[PDB]
Design a protein around this ligand. Structure first.
Ligand SMILES: [Ca+2]
Ligand SMILES: [Ca+2]
Ligand SMILES: [Ca+2]
Length: 386
């Protein structure tokens, strides 16, 4: 349980919002505004109440203490100026006090310029907190990392709370992972089971069925006793795949699509998993498997989706992920999706409006699903615990 920004009266109060405004920038201009558009209702909620609003973010790859116009939040400020009637201005020196009026927006320069940021420095965190009455954490995508503007500030701020974006994220994750509606189906696709083993373990305890995809599925196929040829798999994780297979309901591709080489030119051949040649690499599941997964996902009441079931980057190996993506979309289930690869699939098949909740949390999304403690959330849970 966390305190919510939306439950507070911010009239004439100094509000420090940590947002994710790490947008792609080209020639001093924003090229993708998705993150700002998501953040805007949080900023405006505070502004409309006549609050003294400060918003800040990380951007790009700066070195602490080393300023760089390349990683300045100026392009974000300009965007905000065009999209807001309220006066907007960038402030570069603020660690020792900032002048903020009611109804105006101050953008505090890239926090990653500040020494002690990555290390969650106490002195820096205290300086952040002294700037505000209320600290608002609204960047779930950084909540998994203990940093001065994401974690430490919440230790010393008079009030520490969650913004609308963070709160909606926690609600969605809760709905899917805590007493789900039942036929909770999870999909874990990826190139390596090693990198997603904790994800697999955590979900295997929750899901009624756990669907494996991509290179993860390959290792599971090898675990079933099928030779995978030159397919991407991990021999040192066959035992983990075998362990999960024999103890959990985990669908494994019965048929598969193979290639001769790893290219966008390479042709696709549909074969059973019993007949993979030593020089054939699996790059997508077959038709029979895809239709099987589609049926399972149709009957689900809750779906968690993370990763592809094939190399959808190649048209010849896109069919499998298309069927799965559309099955989740057309399903009456509450569907949550997360992961860079997953979102690219969502955009590719044009089903964003069909998924109940789309997480942009990336690494933070995966770490929450793992059952790992996210520092920013833990902080907010602690402050909210009186
Ligand atoms: Ca304006
Ligand atoms: Ca506007
Ligand atoms: Ca092993």
């Amino acid at each position: 349980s966390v305190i919510k920004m939306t439950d507070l009266d911010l009239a004439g109060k100094r509000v420090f919002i940590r947002a994710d405004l790490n947008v792609p920038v080209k020639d001093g201009k924003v090229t993708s505004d998705a993150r700002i558009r998501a953040s805007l209702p949080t900023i405006e909620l505070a502004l409309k109440q006549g609050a003294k609003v400060m918003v800040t973010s990380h951007l790009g790859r700066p070195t602490e203490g080393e300023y760089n116009e390349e990683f300045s939040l100026l392009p974000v400020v300009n965007y905000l100026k065009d999209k807001l009637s309220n006066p907007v201005r960038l402030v570069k020196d603020y660690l020792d006090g900032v002048d903020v009026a009611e109804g105006e927006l101050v953008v505090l320069e890239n926090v990653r310029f500040n020494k002690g940021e990555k290390k969650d420095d106490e002195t820096l965190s205290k300086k952040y907190a002294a700037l505000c009455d209320v600290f608002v954490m609204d960047a779930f995508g950084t909540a998994h990392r203990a940093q001065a503007s994401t974690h430490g500030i919440g230790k010393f701020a008079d009030v520490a709370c969650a913004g609308p974006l963070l709160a909606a994220e926690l609600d969605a994750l809760g709905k899917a992972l805590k007493e789900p509606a039942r036929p909770m189906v999870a999909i874990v696709g990826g190139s390596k089971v090693s990198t997603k083993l904790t994800v697999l373990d955590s979900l295997s305890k929750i899901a009624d069925q756990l669907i494996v995809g991509g290179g993860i599925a390959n290792t599971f196929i090898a675990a079933q006793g099928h030779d995978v040829g030159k397919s991407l798999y991990e021999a040192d994780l066959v035992d983990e795949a075998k362990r999960l297979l024999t103890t959990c309901n985990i669908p494994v591709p019965s048929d598969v699509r193979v290639a001769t080489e790893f290219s966008e030119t390479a042709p696709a051949t549909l074969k059973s998993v019993n007949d993979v040649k030593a020089d054939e690499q699996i790059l997508d599941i077959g038709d029979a498997s895809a239709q099987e997964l589609a049926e399972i996902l149709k009957n689900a009441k809750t779906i968690l989706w993370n990763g592809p079931v094939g190399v959808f980057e190649f048209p010849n190996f896109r069919k499998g992920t298309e069927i799965v993506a559309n099955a989740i979309a057309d399903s009456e289930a509450f569907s949550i999706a997360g992961g860079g690869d997953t979102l690219a699939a969502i955009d590719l098949f044009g089903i964003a409006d069909k998924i109940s909740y789309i997480s942009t949390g990336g690494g933070a999304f995966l770490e929450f699903v793992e059952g790992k403690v996210l520092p920013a959330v833990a902080m907010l849970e602690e402050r909210a615990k009186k």
